[PDB]
Design a protein around this ligand. Structure first.
Ligand SMILES: NC(=O)C1=CN([C@@H]2O[C@H](COP(=O)(O)OP(=O)(O)OC[C@H]3O[C@@H](n4cnc5c(N)ncnc54)[C@H](O)[C@@H]3O)[C@@H](O)[C@H]2O)C=CC1
Ligand SMILES: Cc1cc2nc3c(=O)[nH]c(=O)nc-3n(C[C@H](O)[C@H](O)[C@H](O)COP(=O)(O)O)c2cc1C
Ligand code: SF4
Ligand code: SF4
Ligand code: SF4
Ligand code: SF4
Ligand code: SF4
Ligand code: FES
Ligand code: FES
Lengths: 439, 226, 227, 139, 120, 156
């Protein structure tokens, strides 16, 4: 499969031996041309407007418009100090795209951070990277040193006079750090509790300054827009969501990997034409479209385009667009128990429904796994689904926690009902006291 | 006449809330026929309060809407914690509903004072005299709070504070005992080294046992290692 | 500002949030993490009300009254069925790990958690699993520590650190193992650490000097006095 | 609807009869959980209202109860007339299997009500007890 | 455990007690007196007791010569066994640590997990 | 008794040079102490707090918040096996059983000689090559229960 720069703006300059592309090879393959154009012939407001009308949406999983998020920065000239943060955390299970994007193409991320910092007038930039990506950290630090040596970073970048300093901040292993306000709290050396919005980080983010947080893939989509134009980016795919997207199927498939596809690609082509379908002797049962925090979908939803609006109307979310396939061998109750165990142990502990209701669901699913389920357990799980939704918890971690549980209850209720064997008992008999025999 | 405002600090003993006094104890006060039953099984006469508007019983008023400023305790039905003060306020976190108790004795004067001309000279450390620098302690300087037995475990052990230069001049380290005479009475204390204390001064814990608060600003003689 | 709570019109201060505005009007909304002197953080999720967009609105949306401004022309419901169910569910979640301690707890009869458990109408337990436990710390001669009773409302750390300026109290740990205390055993160094026994809505921080000769709040004879 | 629900009992025919006889503004209907219509009557119309209830087609023939209430400490008096004290009259019609509670509001200084003894003779002891325990004079 | 629920639930107010604590930390009544000349034998204290400590027993023969002797102290009330509830123990339910029962050793309790523990 | 080394103090101060607030170097300071000594001992919290100018309670809250900062002594090599959903589908349970059989310990425990510390961990971002594990700095993919005893002997 040939990868031309016209249709694969992100993964065309990859090497077949999975080796990182350094500054000489990156600049040979049309490197920093968008950065040169943006920092020489374009105003920062012009770059922000170009990103806004290019239709670039957030690649983290929420789909918010990048230009709209950039336009919400304050217009005051007294707010000179500004921060641009790259969310290289990628702690969601089933997500491995930023690792590939930063282990072998770090200069694309560096160029995108440079363009976005010039557009946002961001005086400093940080890459909030997870601590498990050691080789990605090494490659990013080497690329930053190479760009500083070549004058692409630091003071007086290519004669413009714009000063930009880029740092790499390694995390210490917590899933909630990927949330943008919790990312800002973790960057400030605090416990990674999220913050209430409003105020949004564009108004008062890192250290009270205007701050913009963007995913790795969004900032990697930026230089192609700035180098090839808005009209080229709008014409990659004939869908509502513009540009390409890193999609891929994982989990007991023939070719578990990652590819770059235009928006509107149906999920069957990713599973069959790219991942090779399921393995030998295993048939399809379910799939999660966008990582661990998304609703399960059945085989009937496999003929659906991978867009935000299409998966949103199906009762799920596009998410990171890295789908995971569940075969018939995997028990749904055990899978949901594993998911909820992860979600409960990665709670930040700030708010009551997540902190005290996810362990209840975990214990219920543990009992259902061992056949110790009792009547009212599935009702308790449904009540937890209703009361851990959006607006009820302080952040969006717990709605994403209860999405797979409620989708698996909706689609595979016979597996959850098979775990209820024992009669409900909460009390023991106390000798001398007759119980209130409720009927 | 300068203390004439103390009449309005609280209403007199004839003050009533719709004819009844203000209760000192909650409505569910217990053990009234047993708390004194070991002394005598006959219940004693309820203590009369001729001095104030409060009664030594629950036979009184503690309504949050009662027109008064003196609230003995906050209780409302359904609110047993200190959050019942919300029920006792006009707005939550503001003032009490019918004004806070207490009246200022004087207003702000129409005209001010003159400038105090007497600027003191700078501190000069004289040989053989040690200026007493007061060190106050929240647990130990107030007279009656020292008598509280729970404060002894919280009260610091009393040392004397010395500058590093003065302690090196006297040849004393941290923790050694030095003896000094004030008003012809020699007392001994251990030493801590106070870096921030200016030389020529010695630091003393005011209000402790044997060290009066009147010693602040006084001088010390013959302060030497015991 | 003008708000409409449960079909009744009220005039409030627009600078206030909905929780303090409704509490100033005599309405009873359960709350844990909010304090009048500390501000709003939206942690405990107990103060839920149903906000409607306009007067002709049936769906509404559950919002935190402590985090929602009492702006002019607001429409909310406290006694909405879904809001009552959510507040009862929050109390129930707090009760899953709470120890069976009220007879031997100095906060009994003076406990905000007891009052809000009764206020939401939650008296039936369906949780059957284990309750998490914690070791206690020695906090000095004045404050007794009992971390089993904690509901993780963050009022102690907010008061002690942000308000009182203390440094030796903090929150440690993670998801449901959040621990509120000192990094090591020792006396609380703040001169205003004693206000924790009223700031804490549970019996975690208690008056040790009172706990020596303990009696319940209803058994006390009180008077207004000056320190 | 449960039996303990708060009701105004405005569908009671006695409310319509009182409205037709004395006017809509002559009394105030209070919503309670007593299960009976509670009607606040002016003091000067109490004997007229009692006579009208006594001469109904299925009349209120028994004075079930008559007593007082000290309203001075009552905080939740929403939907109620201004009253330092009040006197209530519980009357039963056996032919209707119904009952009505009339209520008269009294100021603290003006604690006198016309006597009900000319209509119901058990009001003698009931008014003596109300005078004894509340200090309300019955003229 | 000297929780004082029986004293406040008494409509006559004829129970008086004071909480004391042993060195292990368990609560107990320092004294416990009941004025039986006032008691109406209504059983509200036994109903209010969360530990089944106070109990009303089938014994009516309580006549006395002097009214002072109807004040029963703790030495006249505390019996040698469990009475009508032979097995209930409040201190196996309470989270408070006492002698022979540490944190996590009560019923439906998990062992305490330190915040310094390596498990996520 | 704890004392920060000169290299540790220099690295921590250089980390405080990177931010406009010295508190922002707390996670990196804890990671520096952990890299130098295997874990973060009790006096290291007060030492880092004294260097950074923040309370020790803040440092302790940060250290106990993050799972990759060890506040208890660990072994000379830390195995971190993924127990998330994709590695559950790919069968991490056989890997965990093989590790528990070879090391004769439970997760969260260390070996008797202090050689290995077994720990579950969140998703390692290598789900397409699952199951995955992370020994001290090396990530191993495509794990099989037969290859675990061979893989463990190369970490002496
Ligand atoms: N590995 C990953 O990348 C993961 C991604 N996610 C995704 O995260 C999503 C939730 O993201 P959140 O940030 O919690 O919520 P969100 O959807 O409200 O915010 C997403 C972005 O939109 C911006 N935004 C939205 N409304 C705004 C406004 N009015 N003003 C300014 N900025 C505004 C925010 O600044 C933020 O950058 C989930 O839907 C899920 O798909 C979740 C878990 C892991
Ligand atoms: C619990 C939670 C975890 C998240 N983790 C990540 C993450 O690891 N990486 C990421 O880019 N976004 C993550 N996000 C989404 C961010 O909040 C935010 O949308 C993103 O970092 C930047 O937005 P963008 O997609 O417009 O670039 C997470 C959100 C939540 C609620
Ligand atoms: S839902 Fe609540 S407790 Fe859970 S991670 Fe978000 S803020 Fe923290
Ligand atoms: S803190 Fe409150 S609810 Fe908890 S044991 Fe004490 S009195 Fe009971
Ligand atoms: S110790 Fe008390 S004040 Fe602190 S979080 Fe827990 S319940 Fe709230
Ligand atoms: S039985 Fe006696 S002691 Fe017990 S509550 Fe009744 S009157 Fe009081
Ligand atoms: S007898 Fe029972 S109710 Fe009374 S104080 Fe003792 S434990 Fe409490
Ligand atoms: S009081 Fe509003 S969420 Fe806690
Ligand atoms: S699920 Fe194990 S590496 Fe992602």
């Amino acid at each position: 499969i040939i990868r031309t720069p016209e249709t694969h703006p992100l993964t065309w300059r990859l090497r077949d031996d999975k080796q990182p592309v350094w500054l000489d090879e990156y600049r040979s393959k049309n490197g920093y041309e968008g950065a040169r154009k943006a920092l020489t012939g374009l105003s920062p407001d012009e770059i922000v407007n170009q990103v806004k009308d290019a239709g670039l949406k957030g690649r983290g999983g929420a789909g918010f418009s990048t230009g709209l998020k950039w336009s919400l920065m304050p217009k005051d000239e007294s707010m000179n100090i500004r921060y641009l943060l790259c969310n290289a955390d990628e702690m969601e299970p089933g997500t491995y795209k930023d690792r590939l994007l930063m282990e072998q193409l770090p200069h694309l991320l560096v160029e995108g951070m440079l363009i976005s910092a010039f557009a946002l007038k961001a005086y400093r930039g940080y890459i909030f990277l997870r601590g498990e990506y050691i080789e990605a950290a090494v490659n990013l630090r080497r690329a930053i040193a190479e760009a500083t040596e070549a004058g692409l970073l630091g003071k007086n970048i290519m004669g413009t006079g714009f000063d930009f300093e880029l740092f790499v901040h390694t995390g210490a292993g917590r899933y909630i750090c990927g949330e943008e306000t919790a990312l800002i709290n973790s960057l400030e050396g605090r416990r990674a509790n999220p913050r209430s919005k409003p105020p949004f980080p564009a108004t008062s983010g890192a250290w009270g300054k205007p701050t913009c947080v963007n995913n790795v893939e969004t900032l990697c989509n930026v230089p192609a827009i700035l180098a090839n134009g808005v009209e080229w980016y709008q014409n990659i795919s004939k869908s509502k969501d513009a540009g390409t997207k890193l999609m891929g199927f994982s989990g007991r498939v023939k070719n578990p990997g990652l590819w770059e596809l235009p928006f509107g690609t149906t999920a069957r082509e990713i599973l069959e034409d790219y991942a090779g379908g399921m393995r030998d002797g295993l048939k399809f049962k379910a799939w999660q479209p966008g990582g661990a925090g998304t609703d399960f979908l059945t085989e009937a939803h496999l003929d659906l385009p991978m867009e935000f609006e299409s998966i949103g109307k199906a009762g799920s979310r596009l998410g990171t667009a890295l789908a995971m396939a569940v075969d018939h061998e995997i028990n749904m109750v055990s899978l949901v128990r594993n998911l909820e165990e992860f979600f409960a142990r990665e709670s930040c502990g700030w708010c009551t429904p997540c902190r005290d209701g996810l362990p209840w669901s975990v214990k219920i699913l543990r009992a259902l796994e061992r056949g110790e389920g009792q009547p009212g357990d599935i009702e308790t799980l449904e009540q937890l689904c209703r009361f851990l939704g959006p607006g009820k918890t302080f952040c969006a971690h717990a709605p994403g926690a209860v999405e797979p549980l409620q989708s698996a209850i909706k689609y595979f209720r016979e597996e959850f009902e098979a775990g209820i064997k024992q009669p409900f008992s909460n009390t023991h008999l106390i000798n001398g006291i007759q119980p209130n025999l409720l009927k | 006449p300068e203390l004439a405002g103390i009449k309005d600090a609280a209403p007199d003993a004839t003050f009533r809330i719709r004819g009844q006094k203000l209760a000192r104890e909650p409505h569910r006060y217990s053990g009234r026929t047993a708390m004194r039953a070991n002394i005598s099984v006959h219940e004693p006469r309820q203590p009369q309060d001729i001095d104030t508007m409060f009664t030594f019983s629950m036979e009184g008023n503690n309504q949050p809407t009662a027109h008064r400023s003196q609230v003995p305790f906050a209780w409302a039905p359904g609110w047993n914690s200190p959050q019942a003060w919300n029920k006792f306020q006009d707005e939550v976190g503001g003032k009490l509903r019918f004004g806070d108790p207490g009246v200022r004795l004087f207003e702000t004067s129409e005209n001010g004072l003159d400038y105090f001309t007497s600027v003191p000279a700078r501190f000069q450390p004289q040989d053989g005299k040690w200026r007493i620098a007061p060190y106050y302690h929240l647990f130990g300087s107030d007279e009656l709070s020292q008598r509280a037995p729970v404060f002894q475990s919280r009260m610091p052990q009393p040392y004397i504070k010395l500058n590093p230069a003065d302690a090196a001049k006297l040849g004393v380290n941290a923790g050694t005992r030095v003896s000094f005479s004030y008003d012809g009475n020699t007392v001994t204390l251990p030493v801590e080294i106070a870096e921030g204390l200016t030389a020529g001064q010695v630091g003393l814990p005011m209000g402790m046992s044997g060290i009066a608060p009147v010693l602040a600003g006084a001088h010390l003689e013959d302060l030497k290692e015991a | 500002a003008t708000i409409h709570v449960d079909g009744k019109e009220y005039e409030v201060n627009g600078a206030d949030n909905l929780l303090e505005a409704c509490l100033s009007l005599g309405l009873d909304i359960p709350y844990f993490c909010w304090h009048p002197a500390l501000g709003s953080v939206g942690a405990c999720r107990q103060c839920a009300v149903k906000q409607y967009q306009n007067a002709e609105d049936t769906r509404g949306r559950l919002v935190m009254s402590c985090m929602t401004p009492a702006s002019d022309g607001t429409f909310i419901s406290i006694d909405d069925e879904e809001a009552k169910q959510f507040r009862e569910s929050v109390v129930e979640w707090l009760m899953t790990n709470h120890p069976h301690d009220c007879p031997v707890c100095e906060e009994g009869g003076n406990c905000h958690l007891q009052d809000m458990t009764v206020m939401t109408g939650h008296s039936f337990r369906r949780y059957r699993f284990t309750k998490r436990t914690h070791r206690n710390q020695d906090l000095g001669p004045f404050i007794s520590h009992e971390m089993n009773r904690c509901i993780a409302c963050y009022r102690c750390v907010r008061y002690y650190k942000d308000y009182a300026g203390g440094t030796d109290l903090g929150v440690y740990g993670a998801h449901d193992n959040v621990y509120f205390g000192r990094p090591e055993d020792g006396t609380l160094e703040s001169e205003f650490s004693g206000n924790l026994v009223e700031i804490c809505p549970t019996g975690v921080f208690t008056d040790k000097t009172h706990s020596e000769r303990y009696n319940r709040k209803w058994d006390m004879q009180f008077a207004p006095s000056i320190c | 609807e449960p039996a303990w629900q708060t009701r105004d009992h405005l569908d009671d025919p006695v409310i319509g009869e009182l409205r037709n006889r004395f006017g809509p503004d002559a009394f105030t209907v209070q919503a309670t959980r007593t299960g009976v219509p509670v009607v606040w009557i002016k003091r000067e119309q109490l004997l007229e209202v009692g006579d009208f209830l006594k001469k109904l087609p299925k009349p209120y023939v028994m004075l079930f109860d008559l007593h007082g209430m000290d309203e001075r400490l009552r905080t939740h008096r929403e939907g109620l007339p201004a009253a330092d004290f009040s006197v209530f009259y519980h009357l039963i019609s056996i032919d209707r299997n119904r009952d009505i509670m009339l209520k008269v509001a009294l100021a603290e200084n003006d604690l006198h009500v016309p006597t009900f003894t000319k209509l119901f003779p058990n009001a003698n002891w009931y008014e003596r007890e109300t005078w004894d325990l509340f200090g309300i004079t019955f003229d | 455990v000297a929780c004082n629920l029986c004293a406040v639930a008494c409509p006559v107010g004829c129970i008086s007690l004071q909480k004391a604590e042993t060195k292990d930390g368990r609560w107990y009544p320092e004294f416990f007196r009941i004025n039986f000349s006032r008691c109406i034998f209504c059983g509200l204290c036994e109903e209010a007791c969360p530990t089944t400590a106070i109990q009303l027993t089938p014994d009516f023969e309580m006549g006395e010569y002097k009214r002072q002797d109807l004040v029963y102290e703790k030495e006249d009330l505390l019996i040698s066994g469990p009475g009508k509830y032979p097995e209930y123990n409040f201190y196996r339910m309470a989270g408070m640590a006492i002698d022979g029962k540490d944190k996590g050793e009560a019923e439906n309790e998990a062992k305490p997990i330190d915040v310094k523990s390596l498990l996520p | 008794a704890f004392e920060l080394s000169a290299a540790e103090r220099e690295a921590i101060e250089h980390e405080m040079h990177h931010y406009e607030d010295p508190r922002a170097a707390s996670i990196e300071a804890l990671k520096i102490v952990q890299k130098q000594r295997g874990w973060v001992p009790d006096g290291a919290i007060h030492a880092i707090a004294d260097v950074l100018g923040i309370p020790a309670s803040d440092v302790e809250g940060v250290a106990t918040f993050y799972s990759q900062i060890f506040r208890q002594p660990v072994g000379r090599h830390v195995i971190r096996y993924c127990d998330s959903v994709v590695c559950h589908i790919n069968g991490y349970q056989g890997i965990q059983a093989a590790l528990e059989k070879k090391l004769n310990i439970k997760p969260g425990q260390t070996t008797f000689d202090g050689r290995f510390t077994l720990l579950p961990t969140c998703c390692l971002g290598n789900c397409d090559k699952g199951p995955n594990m992370m020994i001290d700095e090396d990530t191993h993919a495509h794990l099989t229960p037969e290859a675990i005893p061979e893989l463990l002997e190369r970490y002496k």
